[PDB]
Amino acid sequence: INTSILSLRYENNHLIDLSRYASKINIGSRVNFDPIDKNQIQLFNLESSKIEVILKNAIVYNSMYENFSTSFWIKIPKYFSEISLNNEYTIINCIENNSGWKVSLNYGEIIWTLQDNKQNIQRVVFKYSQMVAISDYINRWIFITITNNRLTKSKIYINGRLIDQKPISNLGNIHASNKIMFKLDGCRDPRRYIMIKYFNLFDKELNEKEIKDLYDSQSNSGILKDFWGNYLQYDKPYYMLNLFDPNKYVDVNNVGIRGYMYLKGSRSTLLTTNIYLNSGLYMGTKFIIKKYASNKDNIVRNNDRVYINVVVNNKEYRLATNASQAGVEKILSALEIPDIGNLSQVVVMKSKCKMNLQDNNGNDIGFIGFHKFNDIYKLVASNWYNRQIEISSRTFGCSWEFIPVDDGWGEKP
Ligand SMILES: CC(=O)N[C@H]1[C@H](O[C@@H]2[C@H](O)[C@@H](O)[C@@H](O[C@H]3[C@H](O)[C@@H](O)[C@@H](O)O[C@@H]3CO)O[C@@H]2CO)O[C@H](CO)[C@H](O)[C@@H]1O[C@@H]1O[C@H](CO)[C@H](O)[C@H](O[C@]2(C(=O)O)C[C@H](O)[C@@H](NC(C)=O)[C@H]([C@H](O)[C@H](O)CO)O2)[C@H]1O
């Protein structure tokens, strides 16, 4: 990263190039920086929503030989209607006089285009489906890396994994733009946006190990993430997804110590014919993470000790258990916050098993997952999980995602 030729970052209260070249950034009047993490840039389908990088003359691409790579993270809202079918739109443009490079999007596609001075084109494409129960890609932060070896191939990587490659040895002189324009160009959906972060340009072909290291290093692994890959936050309502049984959602039979929380039913079907078919995500009891031990910001960090509130009939209850009940599996209840007394409720948050319940002495009661009790999948804390994780890398019932409302998903709250 310290040897990138362009490193676009929000640092010291402004968007600048941190590279040694210090290229000029021109921003339009409708570029939105996420208050929680201002490196997350939102570009709307508006002419004033644009970032233009004016490259130093030293790094403008004009070569038959120079290898180069780009890396960035992108969050692409779900395509909601037929207006998005068959509508390729440019998002990152370094084409001038029908030569250079660009990144483009289409319904279920991320496209890399290289064009030489003879106007010959090579494209590499990542395709993802919107006909999927739970998507890895729709409206979630994904890590893009494109590498170009002028003697061999153009390669697209997604989350550090090679997806597509095409030969480019038959392309000649490439004279790209001296400007890079981040802007939605030719998108017919007026509500479309993208979110982008951590843009870099490199004057080399990155190798698989460098791409994996970049993915790991830009993941911010000390900070817990929500389903969308935004930072997990305190005092923000979350719908819960269990990764072991994703078609079930959380409910509470009754509040109080005699009640329990459990995984039930089937998720709804979100359907727009020929456009998407997904599992509904805004279902079941909402969870809210509350500060207990701690930073003064609202970000949930690895090993933070917290309370979990659950929302039942529009009122907040406390997720808790009597750790003294029979068996390693401790059934969780939703209790009245006042007069909780000495019941076990402190959760250690971990950045897939996120929630380690502790007794008031600071001993592990175990990761929160579930267990079957007479045909009922009750939520439990269980040290069985803690042990199993240390001796296998399988998915367990303690694997959760936290899903807040996000306008890029489009489901009604
Ligand atoms: C399979 C099982 O029951 N495992 C639990 C385990 O049990 C031990 C042993 O494997 C069994 O044979 C069992 O039976 C005894 C019985 O208790 C006695 O009455 C006796 O007379 O008969 C048998 C002995 O002759 O008991 C053994 C230990 O007592 O015990 C451990 C605790 O030591 C757990 O309770 C095991 O159950 C697991 O519990 C955890 C929470 O602790 C989870 O609920 C596990 O479920 C999931 C998961 O959350 O990860 C999810 C699925 O529901 C489950 N799949 C099933 C059950 O079909 C998977 C799956 O087990 C794992 O992925 C392994 O492939 O895990 C839960 O299994």
Author numbering: 874 to 1167, 1169 to 1225, 1234 to 1295
The authors write:
The crystal structure of HC/A6:GD1a complex was determined at 1.5 Å resolution by molecular replacement in the monoclinic space group P21 with one molecule in the asymmetric unit. Furthermore, HC/A6 forms seven hydrogen bonds with GD1a at Sia5, Gal4, and GalNAc3 through six residues that are conserved among all BoNT/A subtypes. The HC/A6:GD1a interface is most similar to HC/A5, forming a total of 7 hydrogen bonds with the three monosaccharides GalNAc3, Gal4 and Sia5. Overall, the conformation of HC/A6 upon binding GD1a does not change dramatically except for a flipping of the Phe 1278 sidechain towards Sia5 of GD1a and an accompanying widening of loop 1269–1277. However, at the GBS, residue Phe 1278 rotates towards Sia5 and the loop 1269–1277 appears to widen by 4 Å (measured by the difference in Cα position between Arg 1269 and Thr 1277 residues) (magenta). This was observed previously for HC/A2, HC/A3, and HC/A5. For the HC/A6 (crystal form II) structure there is a continuation of electron density between the Nζ of Lys 1236 and Sγ of Cys 1280 residues, whereas in the HC/A6:GD1a structure Cys 1280 forms a disulphide bridge with Cys 1236, and the structure of HC/A6 (crystal form I) shows neither (blue). For the latter, the HCC subdomain is more flexible than the HCN.
The HC, which consists of an N-terminal (HCN) and a C-terminal (HCC) subdomain, is responsible for BoNT’s high target specificity where it forms a dual-receptor complex with synaptic vesicle protein 2 (SV2) and a ganglioside receptor on the surface of motor neurons. A detailed analysis of these two structures along with a previous HC/A6 structure [HC/A6 (crystal form I)], reveals the interactions that occur across the HC/A6:GD1a interface, and the conformational flexibility of HC/A6.
